[PDB]
Point group: C3
Chain length 149, copies 3
């Protein structure tokens, strides 16, 4: 039984030119790319993405940091919502475990490279916000017999 999570490379990931390295970390576990699109995030869409934080003092600067090119992605795998969170590491890179993306690449929470859904409910909401259903692709990985038990 597999699930799907929303992962988004933030403008710092694009500008630091580590997009390929990020994708490779998820491919390495046999996670399937179900969707992928480069766009430029805008305030209206970011207000919806960060709807839980409406009105909080840090939101305007957060939206400013996130207004830029992003790579929208959907990855599929066993327990991938929780596992992708573990792979990204703590929101604050200084607290993230060695071997995680944020510990290996970043310094501060406001520039922490990547977003991933924090729950099944958020994954559904975020995939619906950033992708059209046309953009989610169904296919099977040829190495499935050696990835899944």
């Amino acid at each position: 039984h597999v699930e799907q999570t929303y992962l988004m490379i933030k403008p710092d990931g694009i500008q630091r030119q580590v997009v390929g390295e990020i994708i490779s970390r998820f491919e390495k576990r046999g996670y399937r790319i179900a969707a992928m699109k480069l766009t430029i995030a805008t305030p209206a869409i970011l207000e919806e993405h960060y709807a839980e934080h409406k009105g909080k003092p840090f939101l305007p600067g957060l939206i400013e940091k996130m207004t830029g090119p992003v790579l929208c992605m959907v990855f599929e795998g066993v327990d991938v919502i929780a596992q992708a969170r573990k792979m990204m590491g703590s929101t604050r890179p200084g607290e993230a475990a060695p071997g995680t993306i944020r510990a290996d690449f970043c310094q501060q929470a406001g520039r922490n490279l990547i977003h991933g859904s924090d729950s099944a409910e958020s994954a559904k909401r975020e995939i619906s916000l950033w992708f059209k259903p046309e953009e989610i692709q169904s296919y099977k990985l040829a190495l499935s017999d050696y990835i899944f038990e």
Copy 2:
């Protein structure tokens, strides 16, 4: 004092073509390759390898998954039995620490890439099962003065 451990790349490591990457992780610590052999594991040898699991319900499916090409290896180093276990990570890749082999490459326990001896006694037994003494090679690493205190 160094010791020797038995490490075996399972059929998923062969088929996903990550043999070299696995070997590089152990070489990176200055662990010495003392033996190495590609073979195809068969039910009779796997029954002996997994003798501790005799009679258990999951053993038939385990033998099925393991029937395939494997790379038998012996690595030598300080505390290498316990250290190789640490580097492999938890049996369940989803529970394994970031930076370990199973966390970095895998999703499920039944396809977790690699076996390693879990004790001095099992290392002795496993090395003897898969290798004849004439297959174990003794030489000294040229960088020993910079690896060992």
Copy 3:
């Protein structure tokens, strides 16, 4: 607010020819190279570097192991003194977390590849011991807007 830490690649890092790999790990987080110098450490400077172990029985052998080529470095970043220590891992490689330099490269404390300052006071002292002020270079990373919040 950034700080500076003293990091030194020990003779084993030079001789095992992993200098570039070590530097890349710190560059990967957006830490700035503020100083760098290859030298051959002398007992005189090492006795001051290790002044805290004066009178201990292991000090003569520690100085012996360190009398050799070293790469002196200063890196700058947010919380970089503590973060660089986390990236290095525990003094004993066997106790270090996977994904740290010592766990990924080393076996024993006496050959643990790299030194890093352990506190603000020790960083200030160590930078002054190994570098003249004219050797510390001030410049801004072009990617600063995408590294710092």
